Amino acid sequence: METHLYSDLAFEARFADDEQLPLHLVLDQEVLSNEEAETLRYVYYRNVDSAGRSTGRAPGGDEDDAPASDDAEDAVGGDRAFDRERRTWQRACFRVLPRPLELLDYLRQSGLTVTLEKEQRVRMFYAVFTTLGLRCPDNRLSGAQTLHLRLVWPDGSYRDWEFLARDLLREEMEAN
Amino acid sequence: FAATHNPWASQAGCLSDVLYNTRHRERLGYNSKFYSPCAQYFNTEEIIA
Amino acid sequence: TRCLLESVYTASAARAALQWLDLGPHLLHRRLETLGCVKTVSLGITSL
Amino acid sequence: QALTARFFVPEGLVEFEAQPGALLIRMETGCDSPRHLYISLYLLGIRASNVSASTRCLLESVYTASAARAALQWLDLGPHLLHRRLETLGCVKTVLLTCVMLMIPKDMYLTWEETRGRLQYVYLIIVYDYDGPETRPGIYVLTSSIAHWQTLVDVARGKFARERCSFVNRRITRPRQIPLCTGVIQKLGWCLADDIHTSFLVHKELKLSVVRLDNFSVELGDFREFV
Amino acid sequence: DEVARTDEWKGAGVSRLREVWDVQHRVRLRVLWYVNSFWRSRELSYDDHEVELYRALDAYRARIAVEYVLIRAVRDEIYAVLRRDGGALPQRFACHVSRNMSWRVVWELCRHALALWMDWADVRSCIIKALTPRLSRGAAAAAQRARRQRERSAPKPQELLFGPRNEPAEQTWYADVVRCVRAQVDLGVEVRAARCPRTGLWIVRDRRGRLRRWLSQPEVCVLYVTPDLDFYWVLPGGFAVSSRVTLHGLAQRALRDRFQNFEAVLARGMHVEAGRQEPETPRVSGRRLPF
Amino acid sequence: ANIFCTFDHKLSIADVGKLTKLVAAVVPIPQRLHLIKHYQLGLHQFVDHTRGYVRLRGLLRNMTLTLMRRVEGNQILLHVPTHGLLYTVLNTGPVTWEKGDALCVLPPLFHGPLARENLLTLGQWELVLPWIVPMPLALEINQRLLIMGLFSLDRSYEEVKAAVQQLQTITFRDATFTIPDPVIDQHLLIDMKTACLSMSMVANLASELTMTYVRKLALEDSSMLLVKCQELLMRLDRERSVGEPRTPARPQHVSPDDEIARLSALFVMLRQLDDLIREQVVFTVCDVSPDNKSATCIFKG
Amino acid sequence: EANIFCTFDHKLSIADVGKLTKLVAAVVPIPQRLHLIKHYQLGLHQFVDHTRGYVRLRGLLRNMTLTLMRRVEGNQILLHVPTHGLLYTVLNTGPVTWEKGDALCVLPPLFHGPLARENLLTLGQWELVLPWIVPMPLALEINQRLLIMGLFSLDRSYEEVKAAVQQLQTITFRDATFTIPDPVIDQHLLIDMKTACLSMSMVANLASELTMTYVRKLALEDSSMLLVKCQELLMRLDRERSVGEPRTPARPQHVSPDDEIARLSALFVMLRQLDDLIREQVVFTVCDVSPDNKSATCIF
């Protein structure tokens, strides 16, 4: 829970820079294994426009759209593509609660006011807490944007999940 | 105190330091039986030892 | 062990002998000739 | 070897004080004609919030005196300003008394180990809580086998995280109130692992749960503040 | 006395909490909506036009499709090179043969095997794990190092007499193993590769050191791919379709962001010095105390 | 462990009589020799026009102090103190003492006074003795002269002149002083200048580096303390940039040679303050003589 | 109590007692402060672990007790703990020069570069490793340098921090070059960074509004060389903060002497809290140094 307050404060801090609204997420046994959760190093995220392929590259296209020419020396664009890809990802805040809990009950153990329309008793074996930030370019946001999610472990492997931002905002954004 | 009265000789890796330093001479390939009177001034890797 | 005992034999005569080993068309047995085993050294500027 | 300090002490503080195991502390009073008073640390107990209210009631019922009254007033002036006023002098030898340059209340005594280290240094720790009305000064006396000062401060931060976040809450909520520090570490000496005896005490026909420290070698320490 | 933001953030709580999904319906995770977030106070606007979501779907289709059309490029590369030679493939792998054995059935098994491999390709396959270390920076550096290394002139006797000495022992290949009698393919095979001293043919071995023995089994077939992105396709008998993998029909940035080897940032548990022995991972425990 | 200190110069017996009244007091010597010329005794070797006070405090921090014991016909028997052992020190300091005080040693502020050290001097040598001041007065007078140094740049206005006029006048138990202003001839001394500029620039680099470094550690495991740190810095930014132009564009990317230079510069500029930050105690008193002319004090250090 | 007797499970030959008899008045660490002790916990050999953390060795060593080596006689050692205050003598083997006037600290030893790895005692597998005795400015320098190494290097790839620490690990102190072997990050080092960030946040907060603009005032008044470097640093930090022009300061409104006294006293408290990370307390105060720089007489 503790990253949510800090990430809300930090995305309020940097909102003049990138215009990213924060997005607090929790994940359970339905996505990752406990062995994957007990030693998960960090999480990455990148907001991709429906037409713009990143936010770290140039907005009006990029010079990496020319195809890879099967070259020995510079394999795929050289190292410039590599540190452009290191620029296109961003780190998020991150905590792991390995012992099982229920976020209704657990968020009642912390001092919050859990005010839900109905108490669907959802149980999970291990709760990993994070908060990403999806980038509205101006104040206006498009629903067809997508948000990617890397999960990186100390061996160097990663798991890649992405989803388009309208599915996060089907009934939330139409409520306003 | 005016340094380097020969720019072509005082410098490391100059013309003299490839013509008369013996570490450069054996890498160029030289007959060791011939005497070089300049060589005693140019084996600077031995002078530092 | 090859990189070991090459690292001790770094000398202008040793590498010359190594070039003379593999330079000619003859094999080694038509080239080499034993003398036996050595018992005392002289350790001079040339060795006896 | 002992460094002698003779003291002219009035009769308004001789309650709970005829025993040898007493520590007099020269605090700078608000009144300027004595300029200071040699308060006892058991009077620092009753002001403290970490102690039990039963021992506080005992300390009220044993110290109905104008000297302890005015001393409580002059320590109740400055909010958390005690470390800029309190200054120790060492333990009482024998009571008008003599002092060197050991009994302790059970509640303010604490440890963070299993007290099986042979050599054990003793320290005084004040803490300043700010989630009360203005300031809850908690007194603490700590025996521990640790010796280096800075790792003691790190394990104190590990044990007093509530006090630290209360300090920074006071900093972010009251801008016109500028607090100095959360508290003060100061050593007093060291004991062996054996002389710590949880025992009883009867003084002025009154009952007390005490912890005695026999072979207490005394060494004066500086009021090293810490956040 | 101003209320600190944590207090009314605590008393604010959550409006609602719901689950979402990924695109492929593999991951369900839950979002949290605090009422005290500044996103509530930012009053930001929202719109979802249909051609924009259509462009999103086509971009996601290409981002999925990159490795599959790479597999298709490999497959019709095989088809073009078997049409190129006429269909008489030579041997590249060291294993003996028998003349008195009908090769028509192992040819039919090869056809069925490449069919079953086309049915059962994967984003995690042999060629993807082959070319993932090619995407690194050290791959470009070592490519320059090898291009100056192998293309170095014959040395004069001077550096043979006085210059320092010179030093590519065995290769680290990846492989697909398609087993037709059990209809099970294999995607990730790590294999060590070497050359015989007597003949130039290849010898494959386990990453432990055990000799790989599947080449004797007639029903099975294998695909090898090299770190320099060459290509072999071996039916039993050691005979190998040999080519290179084509990727010029794929964009650079799509392959570069879809999958890429990752260089790590410094976090708790690793050395500031590069290449030092790593200590134990942090490994937050559901079994011990948190401490 | 005794030191002999001789005088090359002619001394009268009346000079001995005006010398022997300083019978048990502290002197500084730069390093311990068994026999030392008197030109190294006292701070006269260091005091001049253009060094200032903070130089005297810094070189007093490592100057080894020595009690005086006896006066002879030409030489002086000095006695170096030891840790934990009691001694007798006379209060030549300008502030009275009480029992249980903690004493520090600070350089004197009345250089060339009306007393002229009760006229103990020589040809181009005046014997100058450091003040022995109680620790709280020592730390507050250090803070007072430092904030005198801050306002020494902006002395144009008159309310700052009234504020520094308050700053000269000090208050203590039967003690009042007019603290000398470190600015002289409309310029600051160099030591106060570098001390105050280093302090202000440490505050500046802290205020512009703490956000990126609390972010860099807050990408790890988080607590309430870093949250309230970030909230405090948000309070500073929301009370700070109310008139500054919007979109200052601070980047999250910054080349490493900048920030390692920033960190090392911040650390060296705070590192040169710890002569005045820490007040290393040197004495506490176990008994005060009547009329506070002397005191049996126990040595610390 | 004071004199601490150690032993040996193995016999010493004449070579072993010969190299032991030149170790008199050398300081060795003892973890226990007990009487009948054993030689495997003597020294740092039970605690030394490469690729484990230099800061861990540093914290345990500053937590360890210290004692002085005197009078071996054959299977006996006679360690004697130095009393607090009295003059003693020391004999260091750490290749660092000394001074008659400075102070000392005790640090886990670095490799000098010749890489001898023979501290003149080895019993089978067991060896003796001696803690380096280091003069105070080098001690706080290596402390602050490992602190910058831990503070900077978070969330960075290996190449930029490698380019930083190839020039950051080297320290040239009085014609002697030293490098730090194991800079690996620690949870204890994380709590040092935590105290560091909280302290610099607090000195960012309660600093005066005039000290936040004081270097701008001294920049507009005077130009000196260190002032030129300070203006370079501060204006580069300003243009990394804001591309706008930094305005000139006027008459400060909130002038109050008690306010400056209170906020700068709390500021001094917080700078003490930050400096006590790197400022180690002394262990030896020099009375005399031997001319061959092998031994010294130090008062502690």
- For the record, the structure tokens of G230 come out as 């300070």
Give the 3-state secondary structure of F169-226: ECCECCECCECCCCEECCEECHHHHHHHHHHHHHHHHHHHHHHHHHHHHHCCCCCHHH
User: Which single residue is written with the structure tokens 């100056």?
Assistant: E148
- For the record, the structure tokens of G210 come out as 């005039």
Instruction: Give the whole-angstrom CA distance, residue B22 versus residue B45.
Output: 9
Going through E35-146 in order, the beta strands assigned E by DSSP cover 46-47
Number of CB atoms found within 10 A of residue F258's CB: 13
Radius of gyration of chain G (CA): 24
Say if residues G153 and E272 touch (Cβ distance below 8 Å). Answer: yes
Burial D146-170 (b: 16+ CB within 10 A, else e): bbbbbebbbebbeebeebbbbbbbb
Chain F residues whose beta carbon lies within 8 Å of the beta carbon of residue D168: 225, 228-229, 232
Do E1 and D174 lie within an 8 Å CB cutoff?
yes
Number of CB atoms found within 10 A of residue F87's CB: 17
Sign of CA dihedral D76, D79, D81, D82: positive
Residue among D82, D41, D74 at smallest CA distance from D59:
D41
Instruction: Give the whole-angstrom CA distance, residue A54 versus residue A64.
Output: 12
Do F228 and E267 lie within an 8 Å CB cutoff?
no
Query: F236 to chain G: nearest residue by CA?
Result: G205
Residues whose CB falls within 8 Å of the CB of residue C44, separated by 6 or more in sequence, listed in order: none
Experimental method: cryo-EM
Instruction: Give the whole-angstrom CA distance, residue F41 versus residue F26.
Output: 11
Q: What is the largest CA-CA distance in chain E?
A: 98
- For the record, the structure tokens of E153 come out as 């002139």
Do D87 and F102 lie within an 8 Å CB cutoff?
yes
Query: E19 to chain A: nearest residue by CA?
Result: A168
Phi, psi (deg, nearest 5) at residue E15: -70, -60
Chain F residues whose beta carbon lies within 8 Å of the beta carbon of residue A13: 211, 230, 234, 237
Residue among F80, F60, F61 at smallest CA distance from F69:
F80
Does an H or E element contain A23, and which? strand A20-27
DSSP strand pairing (G177-178 vs D206-212) = unpaired
Chain E residues whose beta carbon lies within 8 Å of the beta carbon of residue A3: none
Does an H or E element contain B24, and which? helix B22-28
Do E5 and F231 lie within an 8 Å CB cutoff?
yes
Residue among F301, F287, F290 at smallest CA distance from F101:
F287
Which string of DSSP letters, residue by residue, matches E106-124?
HHHHHHHHHHHHHHT--SS
* Residue E197: C-alpha distances to residues D120, E90, E194, G98 (Å): 72, 20, 10, 64
CB pairs under 8 A between B and E: 11
Do G241 and F250 lie within an 8 Å CB cutoff?
yes
Instruction: Give the whole-angstrom CA distance, residue A33 versus residue G99.
Output: 60
Chains in contact with chain D (at least 3 beta-carbon pairs closer than 8 A)? E, F, G
CB of E289 less than 8 A from some CB of D: no
Terminal C-alpha separation, chain G = 18
| D16 burial type by CB count under 10 A (0-12 exposed, 13-18 middle, 19+ buried) | buried
Chain E residues whose beta carbon lies within 8 Å of the beta carbon of residue D169: 4
DSSP strand pairing (G103-107 vs F183-184) = unpaired
Does an H or E element contain E224, and which? strand E220-225
Residue among F179, F167, F146, F163 at smallest CA distance from F54:
F146
Report, in this order, helix, strand and coil percent for chain D, each rounded to 5. 20, 35, 45
* E153/chain B closest Cα distance in angstroms: 16
User: Which single residue is written with the structure tokens 């032991």?
Assistant: G20
* Contact exists between G and B (3 or more beta carbon pairs < 8 Å): no
Report, in this order, helix, strand and coil percent for chain C, each rounded to 5. 40, 0, 60
Residues whose CB falls within 8 Å of the CB of residue G248, separated by 6 or more in sequence, listed in order: G216, G220
* Contact exists between E and D (3 or more beta carbon pairs < 8 Å): yes
User: Which single residue is written with the structure tokens 């061959």?
Assistant: G292
Say if residues D133 and D193 touch (Cβ distance below 8 Å). Answer: no
Instruction: Give the whole-angstrom CA distance, residue E8 versus residue F36.
Output: 71
For residue F167, what is the DSSP state?
H
Residue among D26, D32, D29 at smallest CA distance from D9:
D26
Chain F residues whose beta carbon lies within 8 Å of the beta carbon of residue G156: 256
Phi, psi (deg, nearest 5) at residue A23: -150, 100
Residue among D6, D16, D43, D51 at smallest CA distance from D27:
D43
Say if residues E224 and E161 touch (Cβ distance below 8 Å). Answer: no
Instruction: Give the whole-angstrom CA distance, residue G18 versus residue G11.
Output: 13
DSSP strand pairing (F86-90 vs F294-299) = antiparallel
Do D158 and G191 lie within an 8 Å CB cutoff?
yes
Terminal C-alpha separation, chain B = 25
CA trace torsion F42, F46, F47, F53 (10° rounding): -100
Query: A139 to chain E: nearest residue by CA?
Result: E44
Phi, psi (deg, nearest 5) at residue G87: -65, 135
User: Which single residue is written with the structure tokens 């401060």?
Assistant: D153
Going through E2-120 in order, the beta strands assigned E by DSSP cover 14-21, 28-34, 46-47
Instruction: Give the whole-angstrom CA distance, residue F13 versus residue F19.
Output: 9
Residue among D202, E211, E261 at smallest CA distance from A86:
E261
Residues 177-236 of F with CB under 8 A from E: 220, 224, 227-228, 231
| A83 burial type by CB count under 10 A (0-12 exposed, 13-18 middle, 19+ buried) | middle
Declared resolution, Å: 4.0
- For the record, the structure tokens of A97 come out as 């609660």
